[PDB]
Design a protein around this nucleic acid. Sequence first.
RNA 1: GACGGAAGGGCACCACCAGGCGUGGAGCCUGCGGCUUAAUUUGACUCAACACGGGGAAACUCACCAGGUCCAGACAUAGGAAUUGACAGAUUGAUAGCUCUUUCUUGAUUCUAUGGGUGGUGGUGCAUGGCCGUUCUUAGUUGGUGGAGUGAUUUGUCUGGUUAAUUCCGUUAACGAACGAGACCUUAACCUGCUAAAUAGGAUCAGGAACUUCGUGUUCUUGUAUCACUUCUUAGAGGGACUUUGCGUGUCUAACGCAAGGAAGUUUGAGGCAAUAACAGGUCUGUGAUGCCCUUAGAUGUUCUGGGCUGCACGCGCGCUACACUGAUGCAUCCAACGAGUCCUUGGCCGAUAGGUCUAGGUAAUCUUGUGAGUAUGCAUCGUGAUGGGGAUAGAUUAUUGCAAUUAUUAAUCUUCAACGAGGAAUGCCUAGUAGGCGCAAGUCAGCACGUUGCGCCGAUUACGUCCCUGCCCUUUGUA
Lengths: 94, 200, 103, 51
Amino acid sequence: KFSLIPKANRKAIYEYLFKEGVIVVQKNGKIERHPEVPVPNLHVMMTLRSLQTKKFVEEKFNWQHNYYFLTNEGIEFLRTYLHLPPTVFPSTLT
Amino acid sequence: NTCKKRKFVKDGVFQAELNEFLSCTLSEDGYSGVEVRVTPIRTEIIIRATRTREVLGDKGRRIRELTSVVQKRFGFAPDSVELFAERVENRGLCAMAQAESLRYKLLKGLAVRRACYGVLRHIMESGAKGCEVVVSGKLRAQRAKSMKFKDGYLISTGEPSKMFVDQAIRSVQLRQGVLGVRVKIMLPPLPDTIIVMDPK
Amino acid sequence: QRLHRIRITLTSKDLKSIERVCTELINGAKEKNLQVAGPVRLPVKTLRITTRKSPCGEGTNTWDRFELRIYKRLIDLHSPSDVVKQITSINIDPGVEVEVTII
Amino acid sequence: LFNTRPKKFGPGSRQCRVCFNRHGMVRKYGLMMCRQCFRERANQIGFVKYR
RNA sequence: GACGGAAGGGCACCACCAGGCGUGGAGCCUGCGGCUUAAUUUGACUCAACACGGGGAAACUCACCAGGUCCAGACAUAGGAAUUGACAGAUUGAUAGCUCUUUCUUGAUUCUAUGGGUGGUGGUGCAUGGCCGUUCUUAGUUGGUGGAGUGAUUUGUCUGGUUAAUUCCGUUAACGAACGAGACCUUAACCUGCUAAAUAGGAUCAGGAACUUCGUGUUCUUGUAUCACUUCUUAGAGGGACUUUGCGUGUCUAACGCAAGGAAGUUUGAGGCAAUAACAGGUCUGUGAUGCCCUUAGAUGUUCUGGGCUGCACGCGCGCUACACUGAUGCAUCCAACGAGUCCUUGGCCGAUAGGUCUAGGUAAUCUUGUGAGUAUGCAUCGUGAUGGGGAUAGAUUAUUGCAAUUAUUAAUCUUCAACGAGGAAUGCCUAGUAGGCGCAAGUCAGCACGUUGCGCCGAUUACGUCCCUGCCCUUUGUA
């Protein structure tokens, strides 16, 4: 909705991205939180505006919908913040 | 449910929204086209390509991205959509390949004369009947001046245009502005020609 | 098994896609020799949009006349549902919406 | 409180998915396509013009 | 090359001819000048600006104007250890804690400053892409080798006949090719043939009602009632026109005209598609197509309340309804096709009307719907009076959409009863299911069509030629 996203709900974005490795957000600000993760839709746009400008995630637009991919240096960052076991989620694994 | 006229619209726009996305992600990959084969509760989706190395990447990295990326957006079940890469035989004839090839030659920084002949040479060698390659926009000048390149015959008109040609257009971005780039490629049962037999 | 009645809908954009299916599935029925009636060709629902060609107002006010075409066609049968699942599941076509229905 | 009127109906409610433009919105069969956007992608959807 | 109020050819109802129906006149709707205003956002100005930007604007849209918010300013470096939610009064249109007189809370998301991003319907279409219009609905346009010329260039691409056509036969320093044209694609016309249809019907065979009882005598109605059928209905496969045949017309070569036959003989009718060159055409306001510039928190970002685009001494452009008696009005009769719906609306009650209320079918060849459309037809009253033709202008009331209808969104009911008596000079559109008239449906749409795009119905007059006007194409010719 409005204001800074809680720091628990920061990790709600990251732990979804930690498991699955994709996260697509509709461009619209007033739109409802993205289907999937129960948060505000602005907060998903803000946290991945924050993410792309320090590299890690690979942003790709088309169609208002912003189709992110997560790189090799990206999965290092989340694991450190996440504390997930190393080698926890290979994209080579099915 | 929805009605059949609305269903072909909803399924039809899904093709268009899919295709322009898979143009932009597979730009440096340099793809040919797309197709879909719906079956009951297993919606298959066939990506054609010039090269298969980038699209699978490493043990199906960028396949298993694009399986996930579709089903997040349009609201499918997990493992319902599923992508298969494919090689096109006779790969030169596709027009959207060559426009995307000619993009990265200009975008890296070659002269416009040298690059466009090289793209025109490949499609002529590959066994297209004829072709052209236009490059609009400003070039060695402040006023715009569209250079044109052409070899082999190329029809413009009729319903036989749409089948026997294949035609494509892209942007490409420079320091001073945007260039255009057209490609148009005539392929190999025509209307006009009549091949008469010998009796003996 | 029991005496049933099945009437399978077929719809697509192309003519050529359905004329594969109509020829194939009747011959697929005539493997087992079920009570086939021929494919009942319904009227064609032509969809239509007319937009202006130009983005802005300038020039003469010219118009596109875009069209889709949709082809409802109906293969009739009298046979139980366990028999028909072999016929339909093999030979599925690219971009042809098909739905089997009892009665 | 702020940042929302009732936005339910009229041209202000809805926009072009491809280009975000309300004007020239083709809503026949539920397209939701702005006309500049719609004509160039019409062949890829299915629509082929004749007569 | 272009131009000529020079010649010789061939063409178009965006040009005349012969005409048909109009506009220009009247009021009204709607667009553009101006004039006005806090603001009346702004593009485009001969054809090719002006019911055009799918532009029918109550708010939204919105660019404009008077005010009020939020940062939705990534990240880098750095100080500080920070920023938020808000009651009841104050203050404010405001139940925006915006800011406050006060005092509870928030817990490192952000604040503070410097660099730098970010965003825009800000400016530039004379920096561009893409798209469309126009030159141009016409028949035109290139290079390869060879010939001519010191060269620009030329020849091919042509005296002549023929064609809707650089389309053909032919003539030849040209020969052989490519695009355009043609072919092609879609649709409309005719098949007692082909292949079928409880989501189209017909005919049957048995039953029901009514009149007749004349008798299987006419007209309605009935059913997974049937046996079996495809003429209409629907649509896959196809057939069908080649100017075939006859007589003229021509180096009788290319091909024209006329008559007969035929569903159809202008390429059978009507469209889509559309070359090379371009034009400082239009569009930065269709865009995540974009260079550069502007500005970026006391904002041109964004969004909320209210107004405006509709404001009127007066010019100009597309349309609608009119002036009546081939008519208006009141009753009765009975006929279309294109659509379109998760909203379209039958059925029964209430109500002069609008409309409402309670059930009800429909993801649609099944339901609305066979959409009982209106010019039309039949029977009455009116009587040439601006009259009952005309329905502007204006008061008062009842419903409907919406969160909100005042500058009145419409629809009704009663009144109010103007101009206009066939339109001055100028000038548009059009050759057969065409003109004109009469409705219907869809697009934009919560609501609103006097607008556009398609659809049928009733259905004429007059040409079948021409280069006089207005343009066009090709030669020879003149040019400062």
